[PDB]
Amino acid sequence: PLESQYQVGPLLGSSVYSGIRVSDNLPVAIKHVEKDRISDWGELPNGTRVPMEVVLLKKVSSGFSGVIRLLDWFERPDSFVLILERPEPVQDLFDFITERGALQEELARSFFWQVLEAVRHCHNCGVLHRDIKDENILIDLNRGELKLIDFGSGALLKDTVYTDFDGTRVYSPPEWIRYHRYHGRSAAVWSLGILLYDMVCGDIPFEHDEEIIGGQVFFRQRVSSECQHLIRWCLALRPSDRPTFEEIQNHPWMQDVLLPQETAEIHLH
Template identity: 40%
Template sequence: MAPEIIEVPIMQVPAQMQISLKRRSDEGYNSDNSEQSENGISPTKIRKIDQGDEASKDEIEKEGETFKAKYHVRKVFYNSANGVIYTGFRKSDMTEVCIKQVPKSRVTNFANLEGRRFPLEFVMHVNAAKASHGVVKIYDWFERKTSYVLVMERPKDSVDLFDLSAKYGSLKEDPAKIIFHQIVKICKSLSSSSVFHRDIKDENILVDTETLEVKLIDFGCATEFDRNRVYSSVSGTPEFFPPEVFTENVYKAEPTTVWSLGTLLHVLIYGDIPFHNTEDIVQNKISSKNSSKKLSESCENLLKKMMSPKSEDRPSFDEILAHPWLQDTFPKF
């Protein structure tokens, strides 16, 4: 018998950041200082966003029936920071899907999705998927009595980069280039569509093990991308945060994403994160166990630039894509 999507909250978001950086945390991290919302937009700012209309009780009941008619839920896949991911399939053609359920009690930011009020996460994901085919596709979204449901594609033969690194360790530069080039292009496309993912990390990157095609997932930390805005609330994964988050408590979208990309490239090349506590991030003290592998001069140069302690010294997305290390001919997906 297929499991039902349970209409209850799943887990609590941690109240404070852990100083020791832990790998593969299902809880994630949000710091709102009690005055900001989970996705980093203050209540006064969020009111400026068109949130759409609230659904009636009849509409919600109808959507629940539609969901059950269209999709079969198999089992829990994993817990995310703000909900639960289930595996399943679309009944009409047996297409494999992932189904994310987000309890309403966990949603603080809303936006307009085709005239209706839905979590900002859903709107950011829909916009991102329209901007780049490197983002996991959205098939459907529904409102239920106590939760919101997002139905997404489930890429075949894919694993996340965390599991890939855990299984195979560091990658050679050529496959790392193919993967990394796609991720930078995705981030650039998202910024052009006003989507700031804020949680670029190995666990949120799916890779086809045969073709190395990349898919970005999980927009639970996403907010609007504004190149000139100074952000003051934090959402994402501390081990991928730049030093200014810890030293200044503020950050900008593109330099922060570039730092996260640098951390991600380090994981691809060395098989591990460069820093294991916040003090090391602030002091730019890269783990000594990662210093033995010999890299090309071009790769070392790009890594150094992306992980510059000063945000203004980091390259832009365009400058990364124009860097000599990324000037090979890449597959087109």
């Protein structure tokens, strides 16, 4: 009984509605997915057949983390309904960068660090997001915490090659553009380099396939040499030349990160 357990508010985007849990007035986001549009299906520990997005969310939603957590889900005749956390006030990182332009490196460092920790969490839980981008990152403006959203393109993490992809093409790596093949972790690192450039320059570096495979990063904003080096390393054309998550977080540019509360008070409040 979802119609009686939740009060449904207005649309948040698309089909996600704002909502409130009647049991305790908890703010939630209510996401509806049509069964006809689900291409990837999984099985729960109980054997129940659910969309892969439910499988992945359940795997990452235990304990605290930088992911919007799944609180509950329901099956309807023609759809699935997902009950998600809804922090407030929030702004997604795409709108944040649009409104504020290129971010100061101290702020980009704090944001990038939190995304790395969130992505490490997903990978530790066996989940590959496959659509890391500023549109899929929410900023809790009061707490200075970033939260990953939209696992609808994700997959179980594996060490073998992926040959399917439905994420955002301008964040996808050249091995996908060229050969329709990629490995999970090195593809994630590429999208993270795209995201870091986006933060410190105010928009993504590549729009066309030829730019993605070209291997040339032009900086349209003043960016420190240390930050440029990290970006260019993440955007190595050869996947095996890209850094691991450990090498990213040990990079000199990543040191002395702000705490979330410091980030909020200095840059968001």
